[PDB]
Amino acid sequence: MILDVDYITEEGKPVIRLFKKENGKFKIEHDRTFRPYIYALLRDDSKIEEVKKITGERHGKIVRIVDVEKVEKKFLGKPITVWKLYLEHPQDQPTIREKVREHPAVVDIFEYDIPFAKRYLIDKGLIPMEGEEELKILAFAIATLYHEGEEFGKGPIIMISYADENEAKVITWKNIDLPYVEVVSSEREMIKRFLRIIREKDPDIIVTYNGDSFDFPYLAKRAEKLGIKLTIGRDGSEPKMQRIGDMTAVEVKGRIHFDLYHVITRTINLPTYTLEAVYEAIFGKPKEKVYADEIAKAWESGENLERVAKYSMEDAKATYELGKEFLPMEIQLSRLIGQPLWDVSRSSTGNLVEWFLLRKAYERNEVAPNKPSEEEYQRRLRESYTGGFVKEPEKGLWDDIVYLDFIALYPSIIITHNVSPDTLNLEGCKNYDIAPQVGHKFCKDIPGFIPSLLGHLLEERQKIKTKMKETQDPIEKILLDYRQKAIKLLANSFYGYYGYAKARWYCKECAESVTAWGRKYIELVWKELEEKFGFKVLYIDTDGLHATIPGGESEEIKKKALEFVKYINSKLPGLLELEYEGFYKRGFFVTKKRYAVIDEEGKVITRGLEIVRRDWSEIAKETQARVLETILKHGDVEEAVRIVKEVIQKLANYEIPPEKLAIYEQITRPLHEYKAIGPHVAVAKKLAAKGVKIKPGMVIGYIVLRGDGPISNRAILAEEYDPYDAEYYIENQVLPAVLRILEGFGYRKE
DNA sequence: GGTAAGCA
């Protein structure tokens, strides 16, 4: 199977290399046959003989168009005649493009800034991570002797742990007596053993957690000072930093660096994204953290290292397990998109759709629209449309509730109303559907580019689901499940893609119309659910409704609910389908986007309320959860008021622990660009004053300390407490939190 | 990707 691709300049000409892995043997495969090119649309096709002779320059030398062919393609469905300008080297494309645009007989030019190795994959129709191959995986993590004032790198690497399917060890240079620890002469020899372990194991994939930003760049700094070449690549080569977005990733030749941190952040939505937090949130069992302050003492003392070694071992072990679970999802995306895992694993869903289209656009002989210009991109940002409909809830406590939602609303709208730029407002098209409220016409004679592709996706997904039901072997059952999950992720990325400012196939009018149809079909079911079935729709948000027959018998509300979806689906066009999602014994609707329901088994789904927020104290979440609990389960509002008043005294007596006092707030900008200082900013601003590495995306916790003055300067880091203002955590957190529910019951501050 | 509730 193909693991990666690249090119190298062999005496001025470009050579594609395919890093394969076939039946156990890893083998590089070269190719010199492939030619870089671009497209040029001419006003006068006779003026080709002039354009053929255009010439640029690069690093002193003179550059020209090696060849030219007249090809007929399509553009947004319509047939187009375009000339294919072949060059010699892919880095000639920037200079030639410029000079060809200037020409008056050239209208525009397309597919010019597509990386050369990616052309190869698309054009040759090759797909990474195909076929049956047992890839060797190896996770690893390091440990640094950090002091609070020290720069990045000055501290020695203390440990390097690595994990595997068979074993999981640690490598250090102090004397730790454990079966998994490996004692070594020095830092120098630690790094050396690591490199040997990598050569011995020979991993097809190297897994890490935060490798791109921390693990690898730290190694590099140390290996520089110790004069050691990090021979990690199969080419014998070192890890190379390669920019992909504004982000700077890390690359290893012949192997696949797989940083989990990127994939994780976009898959789930946890409070904090430390390795410890993520591990528990996936599997269940715990994993503690030993801080850099605690380890530095353990290094000087040299007696506490029994546990620090245990910590490092678990990081590698963790990373491997996490890695092992998140990989098949990511390798299936790579297989579906048709790009190397390394990129996919660091690629936004927007981009994933982009590349998916580019490939399919080739397969259909369609010329890809160009990226937006700087002005267009900016003019696209200052442009919007209305989104989903959200009903003001019928507030209060309600019995016997039902949830009904659409199966893949937006995909079904797209597919069945043929929504795409290549069908928008076509001239003299026979049949079309009009967009509600916004009035965009969509031709339905020939199925549009994107709609057509969603069809194939959902059809295949639909084929897998029926295959899973009917399959016997429980191995393929799991692999099927991953394919089907990947197609889902891609399938639901199209609506967002349409309004993505950097999108080649950006189509605001498409996005607007999908939304438009959404509201129509939801408001239909709404009016139809009450006026013809007697239900009372309590709340709505885009995709689904809550309903009930106020006072009615449980089993009747269910019986009629099933009947309503059986009737309404007959009224809905194409793929637009509604379903019976589930039943909830009670439900409490506070505001829009904020409510709680409780199933027949006793579990409570809380959405939007402080319970699931980061920027609220866990004492406020815990208290509020018990207030909800004691209202949803049964009317014990008497002890409910005692539950919260019991917490006021414990919070007053300083009897409540730390962590339950921590408030988390992400830093979304550079500290310089902040125009208004908050509490989480003032903490991270004074940390950076002591040389600490505060970057965007970093979620810090601030506990408020008892004093008097500004709320921001009184907040100290939550990671290290002071062995807090009781007025804040009561009157500005727990009380407001609990009030949100009890407000409807009429309670004041009591 | 738009809709929406909150804190000083």
Place this chain on the structure above:
DNA sequence: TGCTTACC
């Protein structure tokens, strides 16, 4: 307001 985070 500036700001943050959740919802679909």
